């Protein structure tokens, strides 16, 4: 998940 969130939309982001 450290690896996942390095290049996926951040947890708090919507739109």
């Amino acid at each position: 998940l450290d690896k996942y969130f390095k290049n996926h939309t951040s947890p708090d982001v919507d739109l």
């Epitope: 998940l1 690896k3 969130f5 390095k6 290049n7 951040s10 947890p11 708090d12």
Partner: antibody
Framework: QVQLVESGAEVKKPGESLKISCKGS????????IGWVRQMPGKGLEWMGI????????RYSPSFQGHVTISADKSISTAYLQWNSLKASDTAMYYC??????????????????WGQGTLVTVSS | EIVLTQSPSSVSASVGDRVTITCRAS??????LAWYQQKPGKAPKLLIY???SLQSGVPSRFSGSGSGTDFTLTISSLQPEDFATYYC?????????FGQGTNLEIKR
């Protein structure tokens, strides 16, 4: 809630080294890019660099590449900005800020939220 | 780098007036423009991200629009507490850049 805490002020002499800190809380520190921005005289902001605390991968602005070092200690959810040898003209307000991102197919776009209070670094004899 | 140019550089307006600030980017940045408010002596605060998304807790009188190279920040009904410097910022391309800043002052 989400907060970045830095020191408000650091004073050093020219030629001295300095490392300032920014401690994140209220979120998972390893899951967000975090970075540093310099306040320019009067108006203006200059992005300096970012680090991903999950693995310490860094990216610098070409203006700041090789002049500063950004690092992170995920144990204590803290990012750092360091100069080896300060000049008087390095004096400035420095901000740390988290960078939320939106990505599709591994390509990410970023903004700055939230920002720490800023650290006024003064370099003077 | 992508250069962002805000217009105008200073604005003075009355409480209740509509204020509009534009940001023109030197190349396309799609919709990846954020707007910040910065009061004197204080850190910037995000107002708008992704060109038009309003940050939570930011009053609805603030709105953003645009895409490509022409973006607009609009304050629909200026309040005294809106005195600040406003910045745009592109997050599409390294290095990340900010506009030069627009000072907003209140006439009274």
């Amino acid at each position: 809630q989400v907060q970045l805490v830095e020191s408000g002020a650091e004073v050093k002499k020219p030629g001295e080294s300095l490392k300032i800190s920014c401690k994140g809380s209220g979120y998972t520190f390893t899951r967000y890019w975090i970075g540093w921005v310099r306040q320019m005289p009067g108006k203006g902001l200059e992005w300096m660099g970012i680090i991903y605390p999950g693995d310490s991968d860094t990216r610098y602005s070409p203006s700041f590449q090789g002049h500063v070092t950004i690092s992170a200690d995920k144990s204590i959810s803290t990012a750092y900005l360091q100069w080896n040898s300060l000049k008087a003209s390095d004096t400035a307000m420095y901000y740390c800020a988290r960078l939320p991102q939106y990505c599709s197919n591994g390509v990410c776009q970023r903004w700055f939220d939230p920002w720490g209070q800023g650290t006024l670094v003064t370099v003077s004899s | 780098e992508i250069v962002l140019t805000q217009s105008p550089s200073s604005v003075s307006a009355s409480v209740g007036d509509r204020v509009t600030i534009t940001c023109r980017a030197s190349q396309g940045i799609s919709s990846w423009l954020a707007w910040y408010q910065q009061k004197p002596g204080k850190a910037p605060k995000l107002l708008i991200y992704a060109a038009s998304s309003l940050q939570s807790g930011v009053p609805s009188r603030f709105s953003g629009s645009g895409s490509g190279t022409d973006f607009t920040l609009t304050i629909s009904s200026l309040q005294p507490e809106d005195f600040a410097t406003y910045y745009c910022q592109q997050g599409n391309s390294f290095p990340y850049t900010f506009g030069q800043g627009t000072n907003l002052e209140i006439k009274r």
